[PDB]
């Protein structure tokens, strides 16, 4: 009974919050990424990196606070507290955006710690590890968006900043610069997310409305017992209902529940692949054949051509303030505008 | 055409800053999350009825009376993943939650669009943060407004004759 | 020479056919615009 | 429209190659005992 086995005994004790070996990684990294986010959004400015106020201390609200990305001049510097940029000065580290990399890096290692927790608990209780496998999708999204996307770009500055409206800026940046709505990988993502919410809604509603009467109450939640062997709802009735309403229906409960794993997980993976492309500006920006035609035929107009003009407006009107390292001076006469507005 | 509708809508109504849209997002991200979670937990707790050389889906027979997964095992996993009282042990409660979460969230999304139909817009924090002199200190909402302006000045570029876009 | 005992029959049921074809045709319909460009 | 000259063959094979793969596996499943 060595010291490893006694430490393993303690880490795997049945307690209120299970720890585990993964908890050594997970619990400090998650706490710091969470705590770094609250600290930065409560007290930390973005004045020197972005020229923005981003904290409750400066007057922002929950929608507008953020821990913003470091300055573009930092490149992809790890921005360690002891690194050559902050030189151990905590105050300067906060001013240079070191909390962004702190949250991103500890968030990354925490997410690893969380998937390791999923494996560890599934192995201890004796279930298959599909929940960890399904968690690969949010990890793939986090890694592609928060790490691979800025690594492909000029600096961490162009990553998403950890804030509500800051994320909204990230969304509108991707429309205006990348035409990301046109990207078939994003479209697959949308289908997986919306298809996932549909399956969530329809499966929940189908189970609740094909329940067997297992008790006398009109509120039907009491009629379930977790030790029952019997199905609590009628798969046969559900199948007949959906086959007659929609044409097709599930008839295998295992395939149904796998498909529910598969749909949102595949969608998020597809979107991650699209974002990796956008790291290198490999956009699905334009359809070459329409651009050739629109250039030569000034009467050819489509919803795609209209969207490109919207995108040109986004870039011109947002770039001077969104990218203050560039020192864009766009005089009023160069800004694209339609008539009147 | 859908994307054009979305971009112009954001330009004119700041839909991203409207809490009903935000509840819509929580409805759909949560719905996809819960779809993944429920799918994964049920699949993880499937009871062995098949060998390695065949799909585990043949372990279920259509209209069989027995449960095909061990909900006590799944609760025992997920209540150790988070904590015990965070996890459903009642399948009826669990499935109601899977119904109610994306449905209530999408209802808020629909009401968002339908109330921006009457031009009650998302939150406007443009120039909310002012220094001691009175200088505007930009926030992320101010950066959103620049993007919004770019769509607004460019959309329907020949249709407007007067300074305000009123409907 | 004795036959190989690791050989296994392969199956694809009809619903799997319909699902796969749905998948392939929808990916085709989705990506076709990008392939023509 | 001036489209990619390989878009038709790329689309036709992207359809036909995995579709025939699935058809092959379906048909030989049905013929099993």
């Amino acid at each position: 009974r060595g010291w490893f086995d006694i430490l393993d005994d303690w880490l795997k004790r049945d307690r209120f919050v299970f720890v585990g070996w993964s908890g050594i990684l997970l619990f400090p990294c998650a706490y710091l990424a969470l705590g770094g986010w609250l600290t930065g959004t409560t007290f930390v400015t973005s004045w020197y990196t972005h020229g923005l106020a981003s904290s409750y201390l400066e007057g922002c609200n929950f929608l507008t606070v953020a821990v913003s990305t470091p300055a573009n001049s930092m490149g992809h510097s790890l921005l360690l507290l002891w690194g050559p940029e902050a030189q151990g000065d905590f105050t300067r580290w906060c001013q240079l955006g070191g909390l962004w990399t702190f949250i991103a890096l500890h968030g990354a290692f925490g997410l690893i710690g969380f998937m390791l927790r999923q494996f560890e608990i599934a192995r201890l209780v004796g279930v298959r590890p599909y929940n960890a496998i399904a968690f690969s999708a949010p990890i793939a999204v986090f890694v592609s968006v928060f790490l691979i996307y800025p690594l492909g770009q000029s600096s961490w500055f162009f990553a998403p900043s950890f804030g509500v409206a800051a994320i909204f800026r990230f969304l509108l940046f991707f429309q205006g610069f990348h035409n990301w709505t046109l990207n078939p990988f994003h479209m697959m993502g949308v289908a997986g997310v919306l298809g996932g919410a549909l399956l969530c809604a329809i499966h929940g509603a189908t189970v609740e409305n094909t329940l067997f009467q297992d008790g006398e109450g009109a509120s039907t939640f009491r009629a379930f017992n977790p030790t029952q062997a019997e199905e609590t709802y009628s798969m046969v009735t559900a199948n007949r209902f959906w086959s007659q309403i929609f044409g097709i229906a599930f008839s295998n409960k295992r395939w149904l529940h796998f498909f529910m794993l598969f749909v949102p997980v595949t969608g998020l993976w597809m979107s991650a692949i699209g974002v990796v492309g956008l790291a290198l500006n490999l956009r699905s920006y334009d359809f070459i054949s329409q651009e050739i035609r629109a250039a030569e035929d000034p009467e050819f107009e489509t919803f795609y051509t209209k969207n490109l003009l919207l995108n040109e407006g986004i870039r011109a009107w947002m770039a001077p303030q969104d990218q203050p390292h560039e020192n864009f001076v766009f005089p009023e006469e160069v800004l694209p505008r339609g008539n009147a507005l | 055409g859908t994307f054009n509708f979305m971009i112009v809508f954001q330009a004119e109504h700041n839909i991203l800053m409207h809490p009903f849209h935000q509840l819509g997002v929580a409805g759909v991200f949560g719905g996809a999350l819960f779809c993944a979670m429920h799918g994964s937990l049920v699949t993880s707790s499937l009871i062995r009825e098949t060998t390695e050389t065949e799909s585990a889906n043949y372990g279920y027979k259509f209209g069989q009376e027995e449960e095909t997964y061990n909900i006590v095992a799944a609760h025992g996993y997920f209540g150790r993943l988070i904590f015990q009282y965070a996890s459903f042990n009642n399948s009826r409660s669990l499935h109601f939650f899977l119904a109610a979460w994306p449905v209530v969230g999408v209802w808020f999304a629909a009401l968002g669009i339908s109330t921006m139909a009457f031009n009650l817009n998302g939150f406007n924090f443009n120039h909310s943060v002012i220094d001691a002199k009175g200088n505007v200190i930009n926030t992320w909402a101010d950066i959103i407004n620049r993007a919004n302006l770019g769509m607004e000045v460019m959309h329907e570029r020949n249709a407007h004759n007067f300074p305000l876009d009123l409907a | 020479m004795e036959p190989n005992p690791n050989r296994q029959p392969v199956e694809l049921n009809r619903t799997s056919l319909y699902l796969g074809l749905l998948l392939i045709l929808v990916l085709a319909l989705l990506f076709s615009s990008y392939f023509f460009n | 429209m001036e489209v990619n000259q390989l878009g038709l063959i790329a689309t036709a094979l992207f359809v036909l190659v995995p579709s025939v793969f699935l058809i092959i596996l379906y048909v030989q499943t049905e013929s099993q005992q």
């Binding site: 199948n239 | - | 074809l21 929808v26 | 689309t11």
Partner: peptide, 30 residues
């Protein structure tokens, strides 16, 4: 060619709907 290609793929999908509905493997209670 483009228009024909898109309509062709679409028409195959509609046909697949027809077979998936009217020529499914029948759910059998066992």
């Amino acid at each position: 060619m483009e228009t024909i290609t898109y309509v062709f793929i679409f028409a195959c999908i509609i046909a697949l709907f027809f077979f998936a509905i009217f020529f499914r493997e029948p759910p059998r209670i066992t």
